[PDB]
Design a protein around this ligand. Sequence first.
Ligand SMILES: Cc1cc2nc3c(=O)[nH]c(=O)nc-3n(C[C@H](O)[C@H](O)[C@H](O)COP(=O)(O)O)c2cc1C
Ligand SMILES: Cc1cc2nc3c(=O)[nH]c(=O)nc-3n(C[C@H](O)[C@H](O)[C@H](O)COP(=O)(O)O)c2cc1C
Ligand SMILES: Cc1cc2nc3c(=O)[nH]c(=O)nc-3n(C[C@H](O)[C@H](O)[C@H](O)COP(=O)(O)O)c2cc1C
Lengths: 160, 160, 160
Amino acid sequence: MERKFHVLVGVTGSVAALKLPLLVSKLLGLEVAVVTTERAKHFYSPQDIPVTLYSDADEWEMWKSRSDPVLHIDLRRWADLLLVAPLDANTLGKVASGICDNLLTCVMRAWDRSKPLLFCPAMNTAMWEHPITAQQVDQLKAFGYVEIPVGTIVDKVKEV
Amino acid sequence: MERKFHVLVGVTGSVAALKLPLLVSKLLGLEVAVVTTERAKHFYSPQDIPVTLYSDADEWEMWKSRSDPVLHIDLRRWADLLLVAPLDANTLGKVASGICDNLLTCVMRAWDRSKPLLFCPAMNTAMWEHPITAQQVDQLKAFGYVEIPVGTIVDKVKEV
Amino acid sequence: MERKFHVLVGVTGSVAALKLPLLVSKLLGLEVAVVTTERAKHFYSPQDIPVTLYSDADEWEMWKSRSDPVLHIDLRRWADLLLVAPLDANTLGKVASGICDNLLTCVMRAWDRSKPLLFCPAMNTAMWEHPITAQQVDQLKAFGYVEIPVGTIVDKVKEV
Ligand SMILES: Cc1cc2nc3c(=O)[nH]c(=O)nc-3n(C[C@H](O)[C@H](O)[C@H](O)COP(=O)(O)O)c2cc1C
Ligand SMILES: Cc1cc2nc3c(=O)[nH]c(=O)nc-3n(C[C@H](O)[C@H](O)[C@H](O)COP(=O)(O)O)c2cc1C
Ligand SMILES: Cc1cc2nc3c(=O)[nH]c(=O)nc-3n(C[C@H](O)[C@H](O)[C@H](O)COP(=O)(O)O)c2cc1C
């Protein structure tokens, strides 16, 4: 039951999000939406992204009863593909450790295996030139989230 | 030196806490107290729980000098049994990784082996139908915290 | 290119920071600076430390453009030695899991192998008398951060 593809772009606190607009305008048969972390918003302005932006607070403001919706859940059953550009050293360790403390990491931890989750770490030489990152990126591969160590990402989205 | 049993119920951010009142009114020779996470309080109202509710802020407001008490510590030497109903996918990963960033997870990480800590994960099909949860729940078993994958829990509390 | 040694003292939320001033006044050819966590500041007052104190907020207030500086980065290229006295059970698990959610843990996760990072866990009998702490302290040794399970620390700083 798929027509226009539903892609969900997750954004974290890396200077890379500075470029996030580019990704959106490009990536936009696709049909997108971005979900951010708070710090990520430190690299771009909402207006510079012509799409629906879901944030932590967004989830809780719409829930007041068991009848009410569960944004992170609602978003997980809506995306056909979940791209996370960029994935910071922090969220990597959160995901690596099944830590859902924000709307993003929760969408991920509730993800659908059946659907694809391509990510692309984007830290700094230092943070990257450290161990864990490896023991974690592949530890993350254990769930096969298609790494990507703009452009490259863009094309890679499709690849039907 | 035990008369009336001291049970400590921990509550996290799962819709399950919606039921938390039930547990309390039932579980209440037992003598209880609940310790929550902030988000958990998103599923119940304090008044609907006829017991002392300890929260993060509670710890710090009472400490101003080395002489002063350490709530999370004080609570760890007071409970005979520590039930955590529900344990969310998030706190599981916190506990799994020895992460004490809130009054709950700290009480746990300072726990007494000598005393029992029965817990019961309570996420959603998705979040649960994911890996880590397993590599973690049993990773958590390594410390033997008696899983429980209301009712069932209730009875299980006792079982002298 | 080293003259006066640059030591960076990290402080976390353990009652031990109560003593932090001592360390500073002593440790001060050395030339120091302290980087704290928020909770840590619950055990000492800034004024009681005659040095530049870097805090989370400090990083973000100085960054508004890609041209702008990256405190946690700037601090990582400036320290010759990074001592973390005390390292709480919490930050241990953060570091263990490559979790940079605050200025401290970020400086660490971006650390320079080439430079030394001596730390000294400082929790409580309980929190310490637990497993993970071990599977973690040595898991932390994997990156060789020179444990130290005031005084002892002080001398140990030097040891040219
Ligand atoms: C100016 C600046 C640039 C940063 N750049 C990066 C980066 O490129 N990659 C990374 O992993 N972390 C970077 N960080 C650290 C993260 O912002 C910090 O880990 C944050 O907690 C991540 O939060 P999040 O996971 O909610 O987005 C940077 C911090 C600052 C102040
Ligand atoms: C309406 C709603 C329902 C949620 N239900 C669950 C759940 O049933 N299980 C779970 O692990 N997380 C659930 N979450 C996500 C947690 O609330 C989020 O992980 C939170 O950070 C946990 O915080 P805590 O550990 O401080 O309680 C839900 C979020 C929302 C908004
Ligand atoms: C009075 C008091 C004393 C505490 N002492 C310690 C301690 O000695 N060691 C430890 O690991 N945690 C201790 N904690 C718990 C930490 O403060 C809590 O884990 C905190 O989140 C650590 O935050 P940080 O990593 O940002 O500093 C204490 C808490 C309180 C209220």
